[PDB]
Structure formats: C-alpha cells, structure tokens
Design a protein around this nucleic acid. Structure first.
Lengths: 189, 165, 81, 97
RNA sequence: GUGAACCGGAGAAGUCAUUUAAUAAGGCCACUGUUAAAAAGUAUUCCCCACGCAUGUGGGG
C-alpha cells in the first residue's frame, strides 16, 4: 500500500487507469501524467470545504517528475463541540456471561467502560466566496452543497458506540447568520 | 556500551508528545511534573534489568533533555569536539575564536549537575551552522567517565586535532 | 608512586589514606610473614578517616584522640603512664 | 626485574658496574678500567684507597626476566553492589513485611 | 653507625581607575479509536471453643 494517504476526486480515477492502460508511454512520462492528473483532480464538494495538503516523498522520487500546485484552500471552519456545563464522566461495570454451566461461577470477561451525558454547543462557518472559487465559479453546486451540509449537520450523529447507547437526539436550537467577519458565541458558557 | 546504544535508539523512537513533555522540563528537577518522571522511568529502567551496565541517571536525564531540545540524527563518527573544532577553524582568529573557545573550555571544569546550559550554548552554536548529526553514544560514554583524567585529555586532544589538521 | 587524582566521591586526604591502606595490606600479604607480628596504631581526629575498614583488622587499633594514642604507644613500649 | 604499574615501560639495557678481577694471569687491567676512590680503612679519620672498576651491560629478558607486579590498585571508594534476585534479601524482605 | 654525623632562605607589600549588544521576523498547511459483552452465583465458608442426637445453636477472627 501507499505510505501516505492521497485525497482526490473519484470521477477522474478512470483517467488514472488509462495512464496505466497505455503500453507506449515510458515510465517517467507516465509518472508525470499521473502526477498531473492527481494534482489537478480537486473539483469535488468534498475537498471544497476540507481542503487538501499533499507532500510527495523526496527521498524516493525519481528525478524529472515535477509537481504542480496541490494545496486547496479550505472553506469550512468547524470548531470543537464543548458542553455548556461541568462534565460528569461515569464508569460502567460490565461482565460477559457464559451460556454453558461450569465448575466455577461467573467466568467470561470483566471490564469497566465509560460514558457521559451533556448539552453541547456547535459551530460551523462556511466562507461563501472561498467555496465558490474552490468550485471553479459554479453557484448551483455551491448552493446544493450549502443546503446538503445544513441538512446533514442538522440531522446526523457520530457513530461511536451507538449499538449500545443509541443517542440519536436532534438539536433544538439553530442560529444561521450572514456576516462579513466570523464570530463565536461560545463565550456565553 | 550496548545499554547506551539501546538508550539512544529508544530516544530516537520517541513520538512528539513525550518529546514536548521533555522539552517543557528543561532546567528542571526530576521530582516535579510527574509525566516526565514516568516517561524517564519507562525509558531508563528496562536497561538495568537486561543489560548489566547502564548509563548514570543524571547523565541519562541530561542526555534526554538535550535530545528533546536539540533533536539530532545519531551518527557514528560525529563527536562534539570534532564538530566544534571544525566550526572554530572557520572563524575570525582575533576576536570570535577566543570567545567561542572560552565557551567551549568552560565545559571541562564542572560536574554533570551543572553542564546543561554550557552544553546548550554549544548545541545552539551547532544548530546555527545547520548540523544534522551528533554522536550521542560517544558523548554519553564520555560524560559517564567525566572524572577520569585521560577522558578529558582525549577530549581536548581530539578538539585540537580537529582544529589543526 | 601513582599520583593521587581526586574524584567527586572522596577527598584528597581520604584517597591518600586509602592508598596507604592498600599498600599496607599488600605488603602485609607479602614479605611480613608469621616470623614476627607487626603492631600498629591508627589515629584520626574523632575517627574521621578509617584506614582499611574491617579488612581483617589491618590496623590493630582505631583512635580518636591524640592523648589516647600517646598513652597506647607508651603502654606498649614500657607500660609507663 | 620487578615492575611498577602496568603502563610503566622498562629500561632496555641495564648497566652493571663491577670490580675488576685480575685472575693472576691478566695482571694488567684494560684501558677502559677506571679508578674509583672508595676502598675504606677507617671512619672517624676517614681513609680511602683507589680500586679498578669496569662497566658492562645486560639485556633485559635474555639476562633478567621481567617480574610481575603484586596485586594492587589505586584506592577507589567502594561503589557497593546491587542484587535482589539474591535469596537472602528475598527472605530479609519477608522478615520486614 | 656510609665523602658521614650535628644542619630553615628568612624578613615588606591593594592591579587599580572608564563603559547599553544594539537595530528586522507566522511554523505554517491534511485527519472518525473504531468494532463483542447479565454482577451474577445453594448443595461442603478459611479458622478458635461450651452442650448434643441433632439432622445445631451461641461467642471469637
């Protein structure tokens, strides 16, 4: 496998395959074409808001393989989600029962998991101009991305231990603002 | 000296969090900031159990803190006096050379407990000229037997040999 | 014959006394056989420095006052007081 | 020849200064024989007479074997030891507990 | 009890007076610790000491 992760649009990957599909191209030229198609394939709503930072290896790379611009400026500024009160972490003793009777009692496994409950405050910030510029001037795709992001962030939860806690709650207060300078109301808490 | 080699290799294997933990503890004792004590105990204790020899606790602590502040790739054949002489030779021979040589010669007068800042200025001069290597194993071995006269004699002689050529 | 070189774990006097003890031990293991016993007394103020701790009693006595050593030597040589 | 500390080198040619012996056949000494004035008679009115003395040499190893130094070292303070596996400490700790 | 024995190189002294290391600076850029679980359990409690046909009571760890 690759030593480092590569972020790229899916729709261009077939073109990548074509670079390997041609047996008339030398290895250096094919590598340069692969570098070009990897560096240029950034038109996707995914990267648009999350950006990218790709650093090809220098101790291993062959010479004559130049690289174009790979960094993508982000358009999302998600802050960490923090509770609005003093946290109260709790422990949870658990065992693993054995279905077959034995000479001794209990058996299985013994453990102490952890859990907590809180009321959180969340922050999202989308720079409209940077998002539009990142999508190469498309406005319909930017509006679709904004609407899908609002609907997703309004109605999704992280999938951490949902098979045993199932905290599928919904938010009960949302403030949507359109300003020129980003501001945070986390100082209320 | 295999214990010193294992100590230095374990120091290179460290991640960035405990490296920052050690970086924040420069100039400090061992009795405060418990994560530093726990990390140093985890680093140093397995050496004594398997290997009969082990570097001294003060020397090991000083080496760990200096490595945290002045991260250098460990390479055999890059002892501190040789690099210091190579730096000193490409200097003005009237004013800068006596000052830097005085800062170097201050080192061979103290004990282990007071060598931190006089070594840190030396590593700062090294980092100023963009070094990429340092013999931590040889420096640790020399610092262990710092009270033997031939050790200091060979230290000074190696510095003069590198300076002269 | 080997000059005394100081270490952080000892003094100049301590190392000299220790080297004297080592030489006395080596020569007691050598020439001075059981032909005649050798009687010696060792003195340091208030037992400041021991000459050969234990070491099969290299020194026959350990003294912590000058008057006691003078009296011991006098009592050996004639028993006079 | 008895050696001092292990690093110390040794002289390679050992001069011997010995009295000249006539043997009653070689009645006349060689020209290298030199006169020293240390043949005593008395001590309170000190009186000396000369004597013919010659000087030869010896080679170490061929003529005199280098002896080995006795068991000795420069005195160092005892750095003690360390051992827990030791059963005596393994029982001393039980007595303490 | 030795070209030896008996056998001080000693007395006097302040290295002093003067001084800013000053001027310029971003460590930046990318990231799900995720996956499985009853705190339940009667068939001999680990030990001292008073009586009994009880199919055990009392006190001590």
């Amino acid at each position: 496998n690759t030593k480092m992760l590569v972020f790229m649009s899916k729709d261009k990957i077939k073109d990548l395959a074509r670079i390997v599909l041609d047996n008339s191209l030398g290895l250096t030229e094919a590598a340069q074409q692969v570098a070009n198609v990897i560096a240029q394939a950034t038109l996707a709503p995914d990267i648009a808001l999350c950006g990218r930072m790709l650093e090809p290896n220098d101790k291993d790379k062959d010479k004559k393989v130049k690289w174009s611009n790979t960094t993508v400026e982000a358009a999302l500024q998600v802050a960490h989600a923090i509770s609005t009160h003093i946290a109260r972490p709790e422990i949870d003793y658990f065992v693993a029962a054995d279905d077959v009777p034995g000479e001794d009692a209990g058996a299985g496994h013994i453990g102490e998991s952890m859990f907590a409950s809180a009321c959180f405050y969340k922050y999202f910030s989308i720079d409209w101009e940077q998002l539009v510029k990142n999508l190469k001037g498309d406005t319909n795709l930017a509006a679709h991305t904004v609407g899908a992001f609002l609907l997703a962030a309004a109605k999704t939860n992280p999938s951490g231990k949902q098979n045993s806690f199932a905290a599928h709650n919904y938010p009960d207060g949302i403030l949507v603002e359109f300003k020129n300078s980003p501001i945070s109301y986390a100082n209320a808490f | 000296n295999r214990g010193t080699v294992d100590f230095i290799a374990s120091l290179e294997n460290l991640k960035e969090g405990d490296l920052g933990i050690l970086r924040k503890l420069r100039g400090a004792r061992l009795d405060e900031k418990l994560p530093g004590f726990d990390l140093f105990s985890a680093l140093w204790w397995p050496l004594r159990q398997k290997n009969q020899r082990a570097p001294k606790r003060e020397v090991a602590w000083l080496i760990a803190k200096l490595f945290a502040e002045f991260r250098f790739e460990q390479r055999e054949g890059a002892t501190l006096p040789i690099l210091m002489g190579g730096i000193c030779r490409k200097l003005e021979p009237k004013k800068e050379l006596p000052r830097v040589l005085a800062r170097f010669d201050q080192l061979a007068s103290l004990d282990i407990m007071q060598m931190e800042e006089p070594l840190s200025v030396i590593m700062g001069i090294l980092r100023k000229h963009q070094q990429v290597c340092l013999d931590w194993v040889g420096l640790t071995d020399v610092l262990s037997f710092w009270e033997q006269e031939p050790v200091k004699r060979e230290w000074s002689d190696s510095f003069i040999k590198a300076y002269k050529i | 014959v080997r000059p005394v070189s100081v270490v952080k774990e000892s003094d100049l006097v301590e190392q000299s006394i220790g080297q004297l003890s080592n030489y006395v031990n080596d020569i007691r293991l050598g020439y001075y056989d059981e032909q005649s016993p050798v009687i010696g007394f060792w003195f340091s103020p208030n037992n400041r420095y021991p000459l050969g701790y234990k070491h099969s009693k290299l020194a026959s006595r350990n003294i912590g006052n000058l008057n006691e050593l003078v009296g011991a030597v006098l009592d050996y040589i004639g028993g006079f007081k | 020849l008895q050696k001092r500390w292990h690093n110390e080198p040794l002289p390679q040619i050992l001069p011997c200064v010995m009295d000249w012996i006539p043997g009653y056949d070689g009645e006349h000494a060689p020209d290298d024989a030199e006169i020293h004035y240390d043949l005593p008679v008395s001590f309170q009115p000190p009186r000396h007479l000369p004597r013919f003395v010659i000087r030869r040499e010896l080679v170490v190893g061929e003529d005199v074997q280098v002896s080995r130094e006795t068991g000795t070292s420069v005195w160092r303070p005892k750095g003690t030891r360390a051992d827990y596996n030791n059963s005596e400490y393994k029982k001393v700790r039980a007595e303490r507990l």
